Amino acid sequence: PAFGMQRMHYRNGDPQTPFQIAEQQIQNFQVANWLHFVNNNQFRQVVID
Amino acid sequence: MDVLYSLSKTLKDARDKIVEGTLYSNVSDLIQQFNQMIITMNGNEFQTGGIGNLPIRNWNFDFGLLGTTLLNLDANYVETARNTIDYFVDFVDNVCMDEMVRESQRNGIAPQSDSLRKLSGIKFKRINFDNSSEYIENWNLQNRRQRTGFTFHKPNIFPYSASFTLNRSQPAHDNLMGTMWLNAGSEIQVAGFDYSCAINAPANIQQFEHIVQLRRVLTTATITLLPDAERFSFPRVINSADGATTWYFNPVILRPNNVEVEFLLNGQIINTYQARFGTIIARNFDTIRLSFQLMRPPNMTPAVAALFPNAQPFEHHATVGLTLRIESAVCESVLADASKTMLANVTSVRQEYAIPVGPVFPPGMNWTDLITNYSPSREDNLQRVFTVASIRSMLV
Amino acid sequence: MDVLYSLSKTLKDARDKIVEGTLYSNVSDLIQQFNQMIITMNGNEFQTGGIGNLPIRNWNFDFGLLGTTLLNLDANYVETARNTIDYFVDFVDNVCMDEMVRESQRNGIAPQSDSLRKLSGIKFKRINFDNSSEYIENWNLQNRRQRTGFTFHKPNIFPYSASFTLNRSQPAHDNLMGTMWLNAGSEIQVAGFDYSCAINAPANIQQFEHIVQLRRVLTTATITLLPDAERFSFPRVINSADGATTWYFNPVILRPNNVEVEFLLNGQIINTYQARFGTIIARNFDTIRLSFQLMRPPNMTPAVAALFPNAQPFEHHATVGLTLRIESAVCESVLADASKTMLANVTSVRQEYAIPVGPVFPPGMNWTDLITNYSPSREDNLQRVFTVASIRSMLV
Amino acid sequence: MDVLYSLSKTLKDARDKIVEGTLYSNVSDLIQQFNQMIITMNGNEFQTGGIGNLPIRNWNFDFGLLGTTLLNLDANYVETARNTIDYFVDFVDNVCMDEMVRESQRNGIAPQSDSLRKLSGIKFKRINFDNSSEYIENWNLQNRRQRTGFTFHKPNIFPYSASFTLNRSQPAHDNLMGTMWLNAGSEIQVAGFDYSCAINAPANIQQFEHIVQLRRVLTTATITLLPDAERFSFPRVINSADGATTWYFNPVILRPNNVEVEFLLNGQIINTYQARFGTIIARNFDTIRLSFQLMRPPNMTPAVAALFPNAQPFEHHATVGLTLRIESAVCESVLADASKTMLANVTSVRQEYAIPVGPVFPPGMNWTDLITNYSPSREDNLQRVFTVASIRSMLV
Ligand SMILES: [Cl-]
Ligand SMILES: [Zn+2]
Ligand SMILES: [Zn+2]
Ligand SMILES: [Zn+2]
Ligand SMILES: [Zn+2]
């Protein structure tokens, strides 16, 4: 709604999350970049001690 | 080989694709492949050996994964990736060099360097991905005993040989009948000379035949056949077969008569071209038979009739020629050609580090000696080193 | 054609990428494309062959999809994919061989084999994906009425022709002025000879011209022009124009004078090179005009002055020459060249299965006859079979 | 350059992959890259210049994004994409043409046309993605001062030169000792001629030397070395060095003796070949030193003894020749070659639009003049225009 985009018609069971589709669809750089960060924010598995 | 090739391919993809500003979706799959390579290589120690003058080098892999956080790659990302890629390219180039300078008589297709032997372990199979190069494709097909194919522009299939045969000769070398030929690379130039111009030939016809056996079967071959042999059409002073004296050749070029080019496989006739010149196709052959004739002109103008007397002395020696250039062909075995740089790369690496002569290749990587004695062991070792040279040339 | 190429490209990608150990993310899109191919081909019967000695072969497609989930490809996955790929590759090879052996005067661009005509149906359009090769890309660009371009290293643009013209001659053939030329492939050697050495020519200059009309326009052409013609610079007993007698040629080579190479399009001068030798660029032309003059040396040394008397007999004949080699060019139409094997592949397939001579091509696909009469119907059929041969080469 | 190349690569991918019926998953990444390009280019005005006869053109970008919802591409999608692609490809071709016809003395590597300078701005850096072509790969490596590699089949490294040197000469030009040479594109044909056949030479041997200084270093070079020079083996009438008179050459060919080929880098010997003919490898060199000897044959048959008297007059002049042909090589600098079309394309564009001579290149883009004085500024400008021409040939 902020960018005037048609409401996302999201299917239950989609391989992609809504944020991944939106990242592919959002032309604003700051929003798309935050979306990409969320889509790829993961724990790093590290052996410590 | 497939693993080493996959490493080099991943590094080349990373060099070409991890660039400032690029969408992460352009590189996502590449980043996953690269991180898989990092995971597989981490914790493994490699040594690239000290044969010849190649320095002994040790390789340790303790790299962090490439990030996945940016929507567009920035300069910091490119620099971190560049550092990791530079180390990996150094390693792959050193492994390729260490493999190229080694050879084996027993199993020359198998890896010879210790690092390529370690990379053949199952643990590294995760690295393996798209094998789209012609040489790696042929390597995999050969491993499965499938019909391999190497396409060559001007294949260097003929060992260098500039020789002559005298079917008629005498110690003064003034009534000579025979042939002289240059076989070099992809070219054959043959010339039949009769000093008496077939004055006493059974029908005023002097037959010449040249048989060239190819060390490997060639297929789908484009061949230019031209009447004259410009190399054997000027005055020459030629050593005698024993080198004791020198004889004189004063060619005059006549049109070859009844030109018959046969391309033979297993002694059976596959392709026949009679009186055809220009581009011809030999689909599958391993021997070339060129049969031509010096036919005495039934009619001569006074100058022509003066060139060729009825008896000795003979000053103008009637020569017919043939030129045969293999422009393109396909061979199941690796060969040097006019376009690819595999042989030059292997030779350059062997000379740069003064690799001692081994039990497989001639003692300069000299191609005439190699192709003359193209044994199965030599073919195996050459396919290995040429595949490794192509893998190296992907990065270096 | 696009569908057959898509089948072949899918199979080639599957061969190169569906390999043991590789990440599934390396092949996901490829797996989807392969599955789409399977879905589209399922339930369809195809027949190939039945012409010449090409055997009749029936093809039925009932294959399952690849739905297995994995992080990395294992041996089971590869073996299943390999079975499907082998069947599909055999089918595509047979369809390509079936199309390569066929021709039609009308609509020679259109598919000729029944399998390819069936594959042109709308239901198979789903198979279509990346069309990146030069030949298929040109095919699509042409279908769009867009300007296409085939790049050729040494285009086989000149039909073989070793001829001569005598401008001054007599039955004795001892005072001859004229030209002799070899036009073969991408090479043109020409030589103007005057037996009198232009003793009585106006201004002591003899002008020679040679016009070679290319059957197709060439663009972006790199040409090497060399002053001399080594093919017409040695003594030669040449046949009479009617073949009744033979004449004698005893060249002594003078440097050509006022050399002018004109590259023409529709009779207009596009490129002109005057006294320029080495590498030149002809940007767009359908004709080559070589004009060169034999200029009698105004000042001679006694050895030179003795070779050119005032009157007959003339023993040393003054010959000027030129060599013109097209190293690389671009043609809108398909041509044989030195590096590619499409012509050789088509000829090999036609010869191996004993394809009877048809109404479009010359017997044996002889390139000289084909390019001498390179008609629009012949051009359409040739582009069809060359695109099919390039598609076949990807797999065979 | 990276941005222009990325635009061209995106357009080529779109032309090859956005096809009717194809799975959207085949193009998803490409569609993302294409849409990012559209977003970056939308709203920007470009002008392609009016230098020469090249027309001023204005480019305005306001294009819709390509859709994403389809599962298989249909006709509507393909037509929308094709319209956008055609406009973009026209723009890229015009930008490449504008850059190709421009040169600068100081920053010849830097962009010269207005459109390419505008594309160098940061706002367009997001367009940049996979840089996999050899020319753009070398461009990126050159920007980073990294070792560059251009592979050339038959590099055009030697400027055209048909010259002779005489070491023994008289005004009558009858007892001459000297050398003749043609340095063509990749060819060195040299021949030493002694008219007395080394009758009075110490030890009956005449030494000949020929040094060719390459203007750029070559590496991994494949060289065919043949023991005769067919260009200097037929009678000639040759101008004197001043052109005041002509002299006569009547060669008879003897086997070259003590044939030594030295490949040198900065004066140090890198490779040495004695009595080797056929394929040889010169791994790194900028200088070729061909030394050979005419040895008077100690034993002569009566004809050979007749050819060579003990004193003047000398009618049969003993010539010994070598031929050197670089089939493949690697250079750190862009060069013309027999296989690529970059020089031909740049020259064609400059000629078609009547680009006046600039302060960098020789008039007409003549390769001999350019390579004779291949200065660093000329190298920078030439690499720029060659990279632009390669980018252009992806689409045009
Ligand atoms: Cl060539
Ligand atoms: Zn003898
Ligand atoms: Zn006549
Ligand atoms: Zn070539
Ligand atoms: Zn002189």
From Swiss-Prot, chains B, C, D:
Binding residues for Zn(2+): H153
GO-annotated biological processes: fusion of virus membrane with host plasma membrane
Segments for region (Interaction with the inner capsid protein VP2): 62-73
Subcellular location, record wording: Virion
Keyword Metal-binding among UniProt keywords: yes
MF (Gene Ontology): host cell surface receptor binding; metal ion binding; structural molecule activity
Main subcellular location: virion
Origin: domain of life: Viruses
InterPro entries (alphabetical): Capsid_hemagglutn, Rotavirus_A/C_VP6, Virus_capsid_a-hlx_vir
Keywords annotated in UniProt: Calcium, Capsid protein, Intermediate capsid protein, Metal-binding, Ubl conjugation, Virion, Zinc
Record: residues binding Ca(2+): N266, D286
Processing after translation: The N-terminus is blocked. Sumoylated with SUMO1 and SUMO2. Sumoylation of viral proteins seems to have a positive role on viral replication.
Record-level GO cellular component terms: T=13 icosahedral viral capsid; viral envelope; viral intermediate capsid
Function, in words: Intermediate capsid protein that self assembles to form an icosahedral capsid with a T=13 symmetry, which consists of 230 trimers of VP6, with channels at each of its five-fold vertices. This capsid constitutes the middle concentric layer of the viral mature particle. The innermost VP2 capsid and the intermediate VP6 capsid remain intact following cell entry to protect the dsRNA from degradation and to prevent unfavorable antiviral responses in the host cell during all the replication cycle of the virus.
Family label: Belongs to the rotavirus VP6 family.
Subunit structure: Homotrimer. Interacts with the inner capsid protein VP2. Interacts with the outer capsid glycoprotein VP7. Interacts with the outer capsid protein VP5*.
Note: The VP6 trimer contains a zinc ion located at the center of the molecule. The zinc ion is not essential for either trimerization or transcription activity of the DLP. Zinc-depleted VP6 has an increased sensitivity to proteases.
Protein's recorded name: Intermediate capsid protein VP6
Organism: Rotavirus A (strain RVA/Monkey/United States/RRV/1975/G3P5B[3])
